Amino acid sequence: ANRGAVLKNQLIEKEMKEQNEQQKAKFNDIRRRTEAIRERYQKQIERGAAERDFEPVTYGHAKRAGDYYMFKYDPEQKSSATRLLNAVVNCIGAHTDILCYFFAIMTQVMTGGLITLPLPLMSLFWGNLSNPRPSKFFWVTMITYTECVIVIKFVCQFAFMPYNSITWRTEHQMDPMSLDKLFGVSQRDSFALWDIVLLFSLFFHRYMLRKLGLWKSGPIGRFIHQLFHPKFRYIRDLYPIMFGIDVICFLIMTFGYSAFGEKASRIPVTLVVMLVGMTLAIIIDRALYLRKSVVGKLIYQVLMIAFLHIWVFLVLPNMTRRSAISNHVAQALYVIKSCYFLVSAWQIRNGYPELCIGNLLTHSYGMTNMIAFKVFMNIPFLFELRTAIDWTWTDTSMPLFDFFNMENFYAHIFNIKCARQFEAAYPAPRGIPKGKLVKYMMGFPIIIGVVIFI
C-alpha cells in the first residue's frame, strides 16, 4: 500500500484549488465594492451640480468639500473524547516534523555547549526553511550526528577523564567558561534523558515517513529558488501569534532582571541596552510584516538567530559569572524565542497573505473585544507607537495628524458599536425599576472602594 499515498497528492492539488476559488471571490467582491461606491459618488455630484461652490484642487480643499447635497439620500461510536483523541493523534502525526525540532531545541537548552549546537543550527537553517518536504539526506545526517554526539558524550563521561576528578571539579566549579562547560560535557550527576527522547522521536518520524512512502548546478541556488517559488503554497496569517510570543518574551525579559546581572543590587547598563535592542527588533518586525518583504524577513531571522545563539551561549555567562545550565530564566527565554523562530520560518516558507486587516480587535463586537480594546488604549505609549508605525511604513494619502484623527474616530465608532451590541445582547425590562440585588452589588463596591482609597 506504499503507492496509496500518491493519490493524496491529487486531493492536495484540489485543496489549494478550492481555496484559490475563495481568493478569486475574495478579490472579485472588492473589485465590485469599490466601484460601487464610486457610482454612488458619481450620482451625488450629478444631483447637486447647481449647488456646489469652488473646485477642489489641493488636498486641503479636498478635505473640506463636504456639503449637504452628498447627504440627500436615504442610507438604505460517536463520542467527544474519541473526537479529541483522534484530533490529537492526527495533530501529532502531522507535526512530528516540528516536534523533532522542539526536542532538539530542548536538548540544546539543557545540555548547553558547543557539541550539540549543530543540531539546532541544521534544524533551524536547512530543514525548517526547506519548502518541499526536506529530503532523506537531511534526516540521515541528523541521525549520524546524533549517534556521534551521544557516543562522544558517553565516552567522555568516563571517570578517568582529567576533568571528571573531584579536585578539578572543585577548582573549576565557579568559572562559567570552563573547558568542560564550554564543550558541553560535564559530570551531569542527575541523568541524561532528552537526548534519548530526541533520538527516538527522530526515529519515529523516520518510520512515519517510511510508512507514508516519502523516505525514498548551484545546489544553494536551487534551494533558494525552491524556497522562494514553491509549486504549492497556502495563504495564512500568523503575525498575531508572533506578537503574543514576543510580548510574553518581553514580559519574562523585563520581570526577571537579576538573572541577566550579577552585590548585584545595581541594574547594569547592559540590561537597558539589550532591552532597547529588543524594542527595536519588535519595531523592525512590525515594519517588515507591514511592507510584506519576504527577503528582508529571511535576512532578519538569520541574523537574529545567529546573534542570539552566539550571545546566549558565549557572552551572557561572561557578564553574569554563572553557568549557562543554572540560568533557567535565559533557558526559558531561548525556548520561547526558538518557538517564535519556528513560527516565523513557517510564515516565510508559506509566503505572505495578499490581504491584511485593520486590526485583530474589531472583527467581532463582544465583551472580550471591548475589554481588549479598552486595555490596549488605556496603557500609555502603545496606541501612539502603533499609529505612528502605521503611516511610517505604509502608503496613504493623508498627513500624520489626519491619520491620528482617523484612528481616533474609528476607535470611538467601534466603541459605540460594541457598546450597542452588548446592550442589545442583554435585553432590559420595559421600564421596570431596577432590582435590589444588582443595585446592592453595584453600589456597595463603589462606596467601599472610595472609603478604602480615602
Partner: protein
C-alpha cells in the same frame, strides 16, 4: 524614623495627591461633560462603522483618490449635528 520635618509636611503632600487624583483621574472618567453627550448617545452606529470600513477598504485597494473624498464626507458628517442625527436614525 519619625519627625522627618513634620512642619506641615506629609499631610500637605497627602492632601495634594488626594485632591489631584479626585479632580483629574476619577472625576474625568466617572462623569461626562454636556458637550460629549451629543456624540456618545448615538442610537445606531451601523452607517458610520460601514463608512469607516469602506474607507479602510478603499485605502487597502490602492485607490487613494476616493479616500480623501470619504474622509471629507466623514468630517462633514461629524461637523453638522443635524446631518449626524439624521444619518444615525435607527432603522
Amino acid at each position: 524614623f519619625l519627625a522627618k520635618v513634620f512642619k506641615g509636611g506629609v499631610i500637605a503632600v497627602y492632601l495634594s495627591v488626594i485632591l489631584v487624583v479626585g479632580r483629574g483621574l476619577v472625576r474625568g472618567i466617572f462623569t461626562t461633560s454636556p458637550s460629549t453627550v451629543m456624540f456618545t448617545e448615538l442610537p445606531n452606529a451601523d452607517h458610520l462603522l460601514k463608512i469607516c470600513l469602506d474607507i479602510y477598504l478603499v485605502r487597502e485597494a490602492k485607490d487613494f483618490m476616493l479616500e480623501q473624498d470619504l474622509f471629507a464626507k466623514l468630517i462633514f458628517l461629524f461637523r453638522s449635528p443635524a446631518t449626524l442625527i439624521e444619518w444615525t436614525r435607527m432603522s
